[PDB]
Amino acid sequence: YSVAGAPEALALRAGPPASVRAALLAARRRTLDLADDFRAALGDAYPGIGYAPELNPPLWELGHVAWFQEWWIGRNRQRARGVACEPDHAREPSLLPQADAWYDSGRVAHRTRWALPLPDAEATRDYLERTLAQTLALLDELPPDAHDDALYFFRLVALHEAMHAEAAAYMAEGLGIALREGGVAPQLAEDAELELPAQRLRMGSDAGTGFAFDNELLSHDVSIEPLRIDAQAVSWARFLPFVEAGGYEHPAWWSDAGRDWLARQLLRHPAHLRGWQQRRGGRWLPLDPQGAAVHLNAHEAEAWCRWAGRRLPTEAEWECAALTLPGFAWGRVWEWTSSPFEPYPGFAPHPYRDYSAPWFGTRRVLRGACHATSAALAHARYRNFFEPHRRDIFAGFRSCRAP
Ligand SMILES: C[N+](C)(C)[C@@H](Cc1cnc[nH]1)C(=O)O
Ligand SMILES: [Fe+3]
Structure with a gap:
């Protein structure tokens, strides 16, 4: 079998802490670039968009990305266990007292997300920055030969953030919001x-x-x-x-x-x-x-x-x-x-x-x-x-x- 993906995909899944560190930084740069595209169109209005089951408010998405990373990294007392982690073990608080009521996709009802008293865009971006600094401090403790179990949650949260960046892109297209990023058609499609x-x-x-x-x-x-x-x-x-x-x-x-x-x-x-x-x-x-x-x-x-x-x-x-x-x-x-x-x-x-x-x-x-x-x-x-x-x-x- 050939490689399953580009070097970055293999490195995220199998590479050392330095590989996952670079992946978390790249993921955040993409998240913020897409956030800036939405800011240009919507001016940081919350909720900023009408309701549909296939959407979430852009500022909610940002908070969810931060929450998920903090839930599975800084607040997770069983990181080293990897896939053997008890998912519902006792966690210490979030930076935000209401984060678990606002940003947990398994708890917060869909339509509710348009009516929450969320932090403003700047405060949301501060939550993202503070949780990423925590994540990277913890990642920097791991040795070069860290086991898969030790790296599991770092990899998971990088991949989660990548999925929500693609969702920002397809939501943007539905909402008629232009992005700086974009794919290029071939000059000639292959029919072979x-x-x-x-x-x-x-x-x-x-x-x-x-x-x-x-x-x-x-x-x-x-x-x-x-x-x-x-x-x-x-x-x-x-x-x-x-x-x-x-x-x-x-x-x-x-x-x-x-x-x-x-x-x-x-x-x-x-x-x-x-x-x-x-x-x-x-x-x-x-x-x-x-x-x-x-x-x-x-x-x-x-x-x-x-x-x-x-x-x-x-x-x-x-x-x-x-x-x-x-x-x-x-x-x-x-x-x-x-x-x-x-x-x-x-x-x-x-x-x-x-x-x-x-x-x-x-x-x-x-x-x-x-x-x-x-x-x-x-x-x-x-x-x-x-x-x-x-x-x-x-x-x-x-x-x-x-x-
Ligand atoms: C794997 N897809 C893309 C179907 C998921 C990704 C996802 C993000 N946070 C939890 N899951 C989805 O859209 O729900
Ligand atoms: Fe999610």
Whole structure:
């Protein structure tokens, strides 16, 4: 197998304290850069945005990132235990007396987040700074040969912050907020197909390759059947002939859930489009056909596939291809699979017990990464998981077929 991600992703998961230190600093620089993009648009108004289930107020997100880091690092009396940490052991206070009522995503009700007496933006950024200084002081006590258990929570909180930075980016796109950061379409999209031979895949994350998310365990052998798979995610050039052929008016290409979704849509075409313009950073721009198709849900991906005589890969097929085919290029958009988000054999929840387990059975797996995913997070073993209707996320897909 090839490496699963860029050097930063391997270093965060397996590297020494100095690697995780650099990752925490890089994560915070990205968080604050995105916070400054939201500040330019919203002027530090709280809540600053209207209510929707797919949003959180930007200043709430910032406080949550700080709270999570402080909960699992400075206040955690069992850091050295790693995955054996008792999640509900007695903690000493937060810097903020109300932080546990305001920022714990498992405690604070969703709509409530718009109506809390939160600190102002400057005081929120001070909370971030003070908790990061605490975190880094504790990290600097660890020796170069620190065990995985010793580094576990430092790695976890770096990755958590990376996930919320990507959420800031897809929320921004929904809210028409322009960011300084952004991905670049290729001059020419690749349409090629690759052969994936029959093979055994050792799926998931092995005991000692460093940090694993709980949903990557246990590692387990699976059989891969021969297939031909797209070398890259489906481009808008490849997607749009489905729309031109009437695919959003032909219920027969759609599943039952896809038909129920399709019947409740005001606009019979992809999200964010009105050839076509695309709304990006609150500006209507001409659509680039070479870009990866994006903001498509699983129902839209599946219908395209039926129209094309192709299918989605399973997450195992995707992982196998990513690790074994040098021509398999990913990382532009998250890619819907056909696989429901379900535990691997031998799954056990890790100390952040609510990360995976509540979401089994209602989410679909996406693989890969998008342009707004941290280089430290993007990884071929990583399982993303969203409800199959979601279009706000930077999701697209690739297709495959029999040999
Ligand atoms: C793994 N995803 C991206 C589906 C998670 C990430 C997450 C952040 N804080 C807890 N979990 C999500 O959006 O809830
Ligand atoms: Fe979170």
